[PDB]
Design a protein around this ligand. Structure first.
Ligand code: NA
Length: 426
């Protein structure tokens, strides 16, 4: 199948993906949460910031990546051909407390997707301290993998500002227009065949009704598993006939089981892999997200339920052309309820060749970040960098009893490290 380019329609409107549609309606009150945006915010520290150089690098990226010039207009998405160069706002701050107040303001801003730009990038100079770079990107337009690609290019361009990259020979707009993305065969039937075996989302203790949260604010807990333990864990996984993702999903689900009203539950898995329709498809920015339900059914031993989860994961992956968005509608109809939410999410950026993403010695040193997703209470995100497994839980703090998420994270980290070191649980 040869890829079909349409350069004459590069700036014409094109349809939103299912995920993008869900994000847009997620700005309003929903069945599982109040309205909230969908952006991704990171604060960097830069010693000896050269603003002119950073501005050059960032504007080159805007010109290079069509979806940085994209907007949502009249219920569709559209790439703007020419946008005014981004002149980086710079704040002059005297104390880190002043910088914190700016961080808090920018980290919870509302990106209006109808007016370019659907991003924000500002800098803050702190007297006698490294300068701050506050970057806000929207998952409505750039998925998790895309933001790793963009952040690595930003870091690379700032370190080596003399290098010029050749233009990209393929666009996200054309990718969505390809025939493969318009072909559901037995996948819809296969999912419908097991609606009666998909339990609800984790029944975690709440401190209030999630709909009674008018302005959801996300918080982050982050951790890492050292490279020696991550290597050993992946080896134990292989010996146990499990993928690394299945092990992490199984360790996480064990903690979630201990807290939930029912031990069995269903998670929503966020994946980023792309159909290989063009040899450079993995270099571009866009929304390639696929959503897939995965159910945890505990057994006698952790290993049994992990192996059972792996098998289910392998089968489910063979039917991702039917997204979890549709399966949740099918579940709601079979159960005669208005909606079946899945607000507990696992997001994996493993296996995408982004080695040394946010590497230790980066000039743009990440120090603080947060991400928001509508209709999601708890989002466990993972990626690998420098041989190390890095993870973070993004969650609506106000939803849960004080100390609860912090305690689950503590238990999860402890269980993760012990199973990497101790052969007992296997
Ligand atoms: Na987000």
């Amino acid at each position: 199948q040869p890829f079909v380019h349409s350069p004459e329609d590069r700036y014409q409107p094109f349809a939103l993906t299912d995920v993008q549609q869900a994000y847009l309606v997620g700005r309003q009150p929903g069945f599982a949460l109040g309205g909230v945006g969908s952006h991704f915010f990171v604060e960097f520290e830069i010693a000896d910031l050269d603003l002119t150089r950073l501005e050059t690098v960032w504007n080159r990226l805007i010109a290079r990546h069509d979806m940085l010039r994209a907007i949502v207009r009249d219920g569709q998405q559209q790439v703007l051909e020419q946008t005014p160069p981004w002149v980086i706002p710079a704040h002059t701050l005297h104390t880190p407390e002043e910088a914190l107040r700016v961080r808090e303001k920018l980290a919870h801003q509302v990106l209006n997707p109808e007016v370019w730009p659907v991003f924000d990038l500002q800098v803050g100079y702190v007297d006698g301290m490294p300068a701050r770079l506050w970057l806000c990107l929207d998952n409505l337009l750039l998925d998790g993998l895309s933001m790793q690609i963009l952040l690595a290019e930003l870091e690379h361009g700032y370190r080596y500002p003399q290098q010029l990259l050749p233009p990209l020979p393929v666009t996200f707009r054309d990718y969505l227009q390809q025939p493969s993305l318009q072909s559901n065969p037995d996948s819809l039937a296969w999912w419908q065949a097991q609606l009666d075996d998909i339990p609800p989302a984790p029944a975690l203790p709440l401190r209030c009704l999630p709909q009674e949260v008018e302005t959801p604010r996300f918080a982050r807990l982050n951790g890492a598993l050292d490279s020696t333990r991550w290597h050993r864990l992946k080896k134990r996984a292989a010996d146990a006939h499990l993928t690394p993702s299945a092990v992490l999903l199984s360790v996480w689900s064990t903690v979630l089981s201990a807290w939930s009203a029912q031990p069995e539950f269903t998670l929503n898995l966020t994946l980023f892999d792309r159909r290989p329709l063009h040899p450079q498809i993995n270099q571009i920015l866009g929304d390639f997200t696929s959503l897939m339900l995965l159910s945890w059914h505990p057994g006698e031993s952790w290993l049994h339920s992990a192996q059972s989860l792996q098998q289910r994961l392998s089968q489910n992956l063979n039917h991702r052309d039917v997204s979890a968005i549709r399966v949740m509608r099918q579940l709601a109809q079979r159960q005669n309820v208005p909606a079946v939410p899945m607000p507990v999410v696992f997001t994996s950026a493993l296996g995408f060749e982004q080695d040394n993403f946010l590497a230790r010695r980066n000039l743009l040193k990440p120090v603080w970040g947060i991400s928001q997703t509508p209709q999601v209470w708890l989002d466990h995100q993972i990626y690998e960098s420098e041989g190390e497994l890095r993870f973070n839980w993004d969650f609506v703090a106000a939803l849960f009893p004080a100390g609860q998420v912090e305690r689950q994270f503590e238990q999860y980290c402890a269980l993760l490290n012990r199973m990497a070191e101790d052969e007992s649980g296997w």
